[PDB]
Design an enzyme around this catalytic site. Structure first.
Site, mmCIF file in Angstrom:
data_model
loop_
_atom_site.group_PDB
_atom_site.id
_atom_site.type_symbol
_atom_site.label_atom_id
_atom_site.label_comp_id
_atom_site.label_asym_id
_atom_site.label_seq_id
_atom_site.Cartn_x
_atom_site.Cartn_y
_atom_site.Cartn_z
ATOM 1 N N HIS A 1 36.058 21.149 -5.352
ATOM 2 C CA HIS A 1 36.755 21.987 -5.744
ATOM 3 C C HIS A 1 36.573 22.715 -7.067
ATOM 4 O O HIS A 1 38.563 23.947 -6.948
ATOM 5 C CB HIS A 1 38.323 21.429 -5.329
ATOM 6 C CG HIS A 1 39.506 20.973 -4.716
ATOM 7 N ND1 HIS A 1 39.876 20.408 -4.496
ATOM 8 C CD2 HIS A 1 38.424 20.806 -3.318
ATOM 9 C CE1 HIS A 1 39.830 19.272 -2.787
ATOM 10 N NE2 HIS A 1 38.883 19.499 -2.011
ATOM 11 N N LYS B 1 39.098 21.669 13.207
ATOM 12 C CA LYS B 1 37.324 21.828 13.956
ATOM 13 C C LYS B 1 36.291 20.493 12.432
ATOM 14 O O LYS B 1 35.672 19.785 13.793
ATOM 15 C CB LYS B 1 36.708 23.218 12.825
ATOM 16 C CG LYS B 1 35.467 23.020 12.784
ATOM 17 C CD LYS B 1 35.018 24.592 11.691
ATOM 18 C CE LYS B 1 33.286 24.416 11.408
ATOM 19 N NZ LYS B 1 32.967 25.048 12.854
ATOM 20 N N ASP B 2 37.323 20.348 12.051
ATOM 21 C CA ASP B 2 37.219 18.911 11.590
ATOM 22 C C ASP B 2 37.606 17.891 12.523
ATOM 23 O O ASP B 2 36.463 16.504 12.669
ATOM 24 C CB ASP B 2 37.033 18.358 9.581
ATOM 25 C CG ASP B 2 36.659 19.295 8.729
ATOM 26 O OD1 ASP B 2 37.273 19.025 8.173
ATOM 27 O OD2 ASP B 2 35.642 19.889 9.302
#
Ligand SMILES: CCCCCCCC/C=C\CCCCCCCC(=O)OC[C@H](COP(=O)(O)OCCN)OC(=O)CCCCCCC/C=C\CCCCCCCC
Ligand SMILES: CCCCCCCC/C=C\CCCCCCCC(=O)OC[C@H](COP(=O)(O)OCCN)OC(=O)CCCCCCC/C=C\CCCCCCCC
Ligand code: HEC
Ligand code: HEM
Ligand code: HEM
Ligand code: HEM
Ligand SMILES: CO/C=C(/C(=O)OC)c1ccccc1Oc1cc(Oc2ccccc2C#N)ncn1
Ligand SMILES: CCCCCCCCO[C@@H]1O[C@H](CO)[C@@H](O)[C@H](O)[C@H]1O
Ligand SMILES: CCCCCCCCO[C@@H]1O[C@H](CO)[C@@H](O)[C@H](O)[C@H]1O
Ligand SMILES: CCCCCCCCO[C@@H]1O[C@H](CO)[C@@H](O)[C@H](O)[C@H]1O
Lengths: 101, 379, 241, 67, 59, 49, 79, 55, 54
Positions: free
Chosen positions: B201, B227-228
């Protein structure tokens, strides 16, 4: 000599970034020198680079490329950053050298 | 602050990493493996605990406790299947995760990359000790073969090994400590994973074109949460199809036989995900060299960040590097194959070639071709 | 000592991903084991209660277990003693320990059959080929005393004399007990002993696939629906220029 | 008396071009191996080629005739 | 129009959308199971104990 | 100037019911939403199962 | 905090449609498939080669191994 | 359900071992949260008045 | 340790009697549990007396 001067044009087309409408310099990994170089670019060059890149990312997320017509031509590719980047690196090498002395 | 998703000391964390977290708009499916790895981990820990509640770490009861679990526990067989096959899904996902990063120069995120190497080493150790628990023939012999390699380290050789075994051979005191280790490590994995994502991050994600995506970022949710999730079911299908329609496709039948110290199996070979390393191991005839070669087969990953010569991050626009990349991948399938074969001709020579080219490609060719390509771009 | 014959792939009725075991064949295979193999082969992981609802009735199961005397104890005086079997008992061991097993089989050890079809490459195809594959050694090959030639066994010299021959027993369900019929049934039984979950596992596979097909399609549409916004997005560069 | 379809189908299959050829090479090996007194050779390989050919054939038909 | 009715009655207010998923699941399960089991047993006629049971079932 | 800016044509992507520029798109809205929401609600049921 | 401090961007306009006004999987035949083919084509000769090479090496090595298991009649022609 | 049978027996022991091995890690985890919330305010002190004037 | 009714008690005894410093570790662990609780009750007390619970 004009030998690899051809190989280049070959690699250039082999690479394929021109299909995204990106200039060679648009594809550079932004390390420290490149970052400084970019800060020196004139507003207009900078904004053009920005659009070119944002455009490429949009093509990439769409899984498309530009129509063959819009592809950047080997001989029309603008090395807009190489001049600045070259200066940035010398300046740096100067300092590095001087700080040792 | 207006919304409680930012003010709260906890939600704020959940928000800055799974909801309002800035993600590149163009990341592909190769970026779906991190989340699968996370889910994969939560599932192993879950099925692992469920199995642990019926397991007994004792040479005299291990084998049958596992059998009792499959035969009497409600859905014990399902849980056992899922856990065992989950280990493979885990590795498949991890190799694709690693590949993706090598191909897209994600390793330039040094800390994220190094913690990642650590995750892989820990995951291996976990799977290694986990494999011993059922105490079948390959369980014991695998343990025996591999742990003996280290008595080859000069001086602290027999010492370190006998210390690890808790005796003179792989026996009950080994099993019990391996169970403790197998229960423990996954939690270290979960912890280090938090660090992995914390370093990540700092920069945010890299993308397939390898250029700055600040100009076009989208919130993780709903784009990547969807999407995941999709990527989860797409993988989960082949997984379950295997664990339900071909439960033992990947397992060694030799493990359905209680460990017996007086009967060496004919072919002591690891699980698919270790084969490539087993191959490199046997490539160097000389106990010490083979161990180092084995170690290096994975530790090599710590050097990748230092062998980057290209002026571009990814291999998207680097055709020469691209083929070298697929050569490497093919190289690994060959090593995997060699590892599952007996140590004989022609396998022996092929093995040394593939082991030798493996290191050449990573240590010599990749950095060299990279420089070459820089010249061909007039840089 | 080098070279090995690999069994062929028989079309078992339980080979299909969606095809269960023929419980009729399993029931017979149990008889074979009970009356033939159980003489030397242990099957430690199966209990009479396991048969109930699979191949036998609860009454049949209870009866089958009572035919056996199991050792219970200690009693009031700390003595061991015999008693008739309950359905909670596991199939009886032919020998106390492997030393006694070997002692009675020329130092050879007949393995427990509970997981045999999974403990051997080939599985039931292997066990079937082995049982029906005994023959005479080819020229140049001599089998030492006590061993029998079987091309399917590694090394070709096995310590198990051909266990089955035609009519070696009678199927009380009225099936022609040919040698291959027997091997076929006992192998089917062994598949079941290795994994009683077999049928349920497959029934679950069917549900998994359907739900998987359904759920993946649905999620694909949703992923696409959301991304449609970026997929069709159009942009333009409009400098003051 | 009873007849095992296995033995029946074994015969039918041994009457196959495939087996007939393998069976032929076998008998030859047996022949010379049996007729010497200091040879290493064995006919395992030949026997296997035969059994492989035959048995592969038997598999295709055997279960049809079993309950 | 079912889609409109569905939308108005079920998918508009989040409360009803959840009620639809629950009630929808209760009904989907009942139906889906019967169906799958139905399929599984047909694809396996006379092989399951369910099928042969009668032969020994006779006290 | 901004007066010279117009929205590109989305005919290549518009759903059939909002393809025509002279038709109220509201009339077909509960239809378009009802469909997409139906897919979602179904995914939930599949998952709750 | 990461939204609003990312990049200095100027003069770019973007147009987008609600997901309910458009189709999820539009132009499958006129746009989608062509591209799938385009993408496949552009990569096949970069990926396939080494995998084909691997396969060959695999076949050779597997057969060469089984061949060394067979017997050479040229060891028994004398006797 | 908890016993895994009809009385405290072996299946209870094995699951209790699993739990005993597990919970301490949950304790370590929740402890991090404990200190995270704590750092939002900082420590209280024995006089119960603001110590910002003297930290 | 071995989690089985037939080996638990003795696995703990084996640990105390054979493992190097097993007795020490066993002691420290068992007694550490009390140290833990003493400390926790004083931790809680303090908070009740000083209104930390706010
Ligand atoms: C390691 C242990 C060894 C185990 C065996 C290895 C697994 C072998 C499985 C084969 C991999 C299947 C994937 C094939 C997919 C083919 C494909 O799509 O390639 C083309 C495609 C084109 O990408 P762009 O140039 O960015 O296109 C943008 C412009 N249009 O390339 C990619 O998708 C990127 C490659 C990422 C996947 C790599 C996966 C290989 C995995 C192996 C591990 C290798 C690394 C070393 C690990 C050491 C431990
Ligand atoms: C018999 C069984 C009956 C009992 C089961 C009870 C379960 C019911 C759950 C409550 C109903 C859910 C309510 C959802 C409401 C929230 C919402 O907005 O929808 C979800 C929302 C959709 O957004 P919109 O389309 O914009 O909807 C706008 C509505 N006007 O988010 C989603 O996409 C979630 C739905 C997708 C689920 C994805 C899950 C994928 C997982 C698959 C793997 C399998 C599962 C295994 C579980 C592991 C357990 C250890
Ligand atoms: C007289 C005892 C006896 C009988 C009866 C017998 N076996 Fe065996 N079996 C053995 C012995 C002894 C071996 C060990 C062979 C060896 O390891 O050399 C053996 C081994 C086996 C093996 C294969 C071992 C391997 O390593 O592949 C299988 C499978 C097997 N038996 C199946 C059966 C089945 C099925 C039956 C009943 C149809 C049966 N046996 C009946 C004695 C017997
Ligand atoms: C238990 C194992 C692991 C977990 C749970 C994990 C998880 C993640 C997650 C969730 C991400 C973000 C999404 C993504 O990019 O896929 C990520 C990114 C990353 N991981 Fe891992 N990872 C694991 C192992 C590793 C390993 C073994 C490496 C490499 C040696 C690695 C290297 C990276 C890098 C460099 C990124 C940056 C991705 C980018 O380029 O944007 N990870 N990982
Ligand atoms: C990183 C996650 C994990 C990995 C990679 C992993 C891997 C494995 C492997 C390779 C096996 C052997 C499978 C086989 O039977 O063939 C195994 C067994 C086992 N694992 Fe894990 N495991 C994981 C987590 C856990 C955890 C957290 C627990 C529970 C505290 C656990 C408990 C067990 C038990 C009880 C066994 C023995 C029973 C069996 O073999 O099925 N595992 N594990
Ligand atoms: C495994 C148990 C626990 C750990 C490791 C732990 C740890 C800590 C630590 C290190 C602090 C800062 C130092 C201090 O003020 O003493 C703290 C503060 C505090 N803890 Fe805990 N604690 C635990 C349990 C509890 C419990 C049971 C309560 C009360 C139900 C509690 C209430 C508090 C509160 C309110 C503070 C604020 C102290 C102040 O007034 O400044 N803690 N704890
Ligand atoms: C206990 O043996 C476990 C095995 C296993 O495969 O577990 C999943 C195993 C079985 C048979 C033979 C060997 C086995 O173990 C292993 C272990 C192994 O570990 C490494 C993997 C990569 C790099 C270094 C090592 C080491 N050491 N590499 C190859 N085989
Ligand atoms: O990385 C992320 O960094 C955040 C900021 O430290 C943490 O709050 C998250 O838990 C962590 O996953
Ligand atoms: C086939 O038997 C099955 O055995 C299972 C045991 O796990 C049960 O849960 C199933 O309901 C039953 O049909
Ligand atoms: C990808 C999501 C896959 C989910 C698959 C759910 C199917 C589980 O279905 C199972 O079938 C068994 C046999 O009929 C039953 O005995 C179980 O109770 C039932 O839960």
């Amino acid at each position: 000599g004009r030998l690899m001067d051809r190989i280049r044009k070959w690699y250039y087309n082999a690479a394929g970034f021109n299909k995204y409408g990106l200039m060679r310099d648009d594809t550079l990994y932004e390390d420290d020198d490149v970052k400084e170089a970019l800060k020196r670019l004139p507003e207009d060059l900078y904004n053009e680079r920005m659009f070119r890149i944002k455009r490429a990312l949009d093509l990439s997320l769409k899984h498309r490329i530009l129509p063959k017509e819009q592809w950047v031509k080997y001989e029309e590719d603008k090395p807009y950053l190489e001049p600045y980047l070259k200066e940035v690196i010398r300046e740096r090498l100067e300092r590095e050298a001087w700080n040792k002395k | 602050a207006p919304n409680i998703r930012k003010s709260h000391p906890l939600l704020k964390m959940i928000n800055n990493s799974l909801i309002d977290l800035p993600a590149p708009s163009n990341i592909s499916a190769w970026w779906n493996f991190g989340s699968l790895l996370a889910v994969c981990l939560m599932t192993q820990i879950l099925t692992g605990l469920l199995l642990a509640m019926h397991y007994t770490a004792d040479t005299s009861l291990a084998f049958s406790s596992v059998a009792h679990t499959c035969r009497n526990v409600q859905y014990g067989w399902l849980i056992r299947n899922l856990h065992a096959n989950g280990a493979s899904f885990f590795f498949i996902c991890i190799f694709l995760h690693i590949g993706r990063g090598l191909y897209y120069g994600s390793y330039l995120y040094k800390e994220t990359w190094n913690t990642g190497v650590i995750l892989l080493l820990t995951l291996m150790a976990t799977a290694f000790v986990g494999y011993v628990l059922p105490w079948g023939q390959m369980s014991f012999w695998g343990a025996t073969v591999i742990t003996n390699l280290f008595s080859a380290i000069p001086y602290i050789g027999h010492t370190l090994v006998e210390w690890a075994w808790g005796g003179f051979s792989v026996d009950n005191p080994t099993l019990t400590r391996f169970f403790a280790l197998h229960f423990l490590l996954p939690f270290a994995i979960a912890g280090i994973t938090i660090i992995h994502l914390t370093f990540l991050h700092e920069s945010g994600s890299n993308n397939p074109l390898g250029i700055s995506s600040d100009s076009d970022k989208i919130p993780f949710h709903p784009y990547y949460s969807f999407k995941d999730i999709l990527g989860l079911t797409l993988m989960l299908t082949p997984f379950l199809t295997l664990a339900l329609f071909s439960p033992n496709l990947l397992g060694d039948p030799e493990n359905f036989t209680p460990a017996n110290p007086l009967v060496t199996p004919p072919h002591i070979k690891p699980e698919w995900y270790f084969l490539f390393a087993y191959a490199i191991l046997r490539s160097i005839p000389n106990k010490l060299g083979g161990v180092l070669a084995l170690a290096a087969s994975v530790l090599i990953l710590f050097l990748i960040p230092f062998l980057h010569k290209s002026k571009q991050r990814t291999m998207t626009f680097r055709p020469l590097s691209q083929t070298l990349f697929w050569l490497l991948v093919a190289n690994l399938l060959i090593l995997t194959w060699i590892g599952s074969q007996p140590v004989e001709h022609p396998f022996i020579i092929i093995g040394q070639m593939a082991s030798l080219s493996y290191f050449t490609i990573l240590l010599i060719l990749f950095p060299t071709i990279g420089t070459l390509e820089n010249k061909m771009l007039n840089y | 000592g080098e070279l090995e014959l690999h069994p062929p792939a028989f079309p078992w009725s339980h080979g299909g991903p969606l095809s269960a075991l023929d419980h009729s064949s399993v029931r017979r295979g149990f008889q074979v084991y009970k009356q033939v193999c159980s003489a030397c082969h242990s099957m430690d992981y199966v209990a009479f209660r396991n048969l109930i609802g699979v191949t036998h009735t609860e009454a049949e199961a209870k009866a089958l277990a009572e035919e056996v005397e199991v050792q219970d104890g200690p009693d009031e005086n700390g003595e061991l003693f015999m008693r008739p079997g309950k359905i909670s008992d596991y199939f009886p061991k032919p020998y106390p320990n492997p030393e006694a097993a070997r002692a009675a089989n020329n130092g050879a050890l007949p393995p427990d059959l509970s997981y045999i079809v999974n403990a051997r490459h080939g599985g039931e195809d292997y066990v079937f080929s082995l049982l029906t594959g005994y023959c005479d050694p080819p020229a140049g090959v001599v089998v030492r005393e006590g061993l029998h030639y079987n091309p399917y066994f590694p090394g070709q010299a096995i310590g198990m004399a051909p266990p089955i021959y035609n009519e070696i027993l009678e199927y009380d369900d009225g099936t022609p007990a040919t040698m291959s019929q027997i091997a076929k049934d006992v192998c089917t039984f062994l598949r079941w002993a290795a994994e009683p979950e077999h049928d349920q596992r497959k029934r679950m596979g069917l549900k998994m696939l359907l739900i998987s097909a359904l759920l993946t399609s649905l999620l694909y549409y949703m992923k696409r629906h959301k991304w449609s916004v970026l997929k069709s997005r159009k942009m333009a560069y409009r400098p003051p220029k | 008396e009873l007849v095992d379809p296995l033995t029946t189908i074994r015969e039918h299959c041994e009457q196959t071009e495939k087996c007939v050829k393998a069976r032929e090479r076998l008998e030859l090996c047996d022949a010379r191996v049996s007729s010497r007194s200091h040879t290493e050779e064995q006919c395992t390989e030949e026997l296997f080629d035969f059994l492989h050919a035959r048995d592969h054939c038997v598999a295709h038909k055997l279960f049809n005739k079993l309950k | 129009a079912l889609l409109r009715q569905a939308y108005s009655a079920l998918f508009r207010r989040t409360s009803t959308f959840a009620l639809t998923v629950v009630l929808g699941a209760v009904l989907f399960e009942r139906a889906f199971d019967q169906g799958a089991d139905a399929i599984f047993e047909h694809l396996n006629e006379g092989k399951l104990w369910k099928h042969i049971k009668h032969k020994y079932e006779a006290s | 100037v901004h007066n010279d800016v117009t929205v590109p044509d989305f005919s290549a992507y518009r759903r059939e019911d909002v393809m025509d520029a002279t038709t109220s798109s509201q009339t077909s809205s509960e239809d378009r939403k009802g469909f997409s929401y139906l897919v979602t609600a179904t995914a939930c049921v599949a998952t709750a199962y | 905090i990461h939204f609003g401090n990312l990049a200095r961007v100027r003069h770019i306009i973007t147009y987008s449609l609600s997901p309910f006004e458009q189709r999820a999987i539009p132009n499958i035949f006129s746009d989608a498939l062509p591209n799938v083919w385009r993408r496949f084509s552009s990569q096949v000769f970069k990926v396939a080669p080494p995998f084909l090479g691997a396969y060959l090496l695999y076949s050779w090595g597997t057969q060469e191994f089984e061949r060394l298991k067979r017997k050479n009649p040229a060891d028994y022609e004398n006797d």
